[PDB]
């Protein structure tokens, strides 16, 4: 997974922020 305020992509990654936290992504976004 990922950190606080790090960026994300699961469309093409397919790897969710770290829990408690939340990718706010398709391709290009961040962790929240």
Known sequence: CIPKW???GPK???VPCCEPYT???DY???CS
Do not use: F
């Open 6 to 8: 790090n960026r994300c």
């Open 12 to 14: 093409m990654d397919g």
């Open 28 to 30: 290009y976004g961040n």
């Open 23 to 25: 990718c706010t992504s």
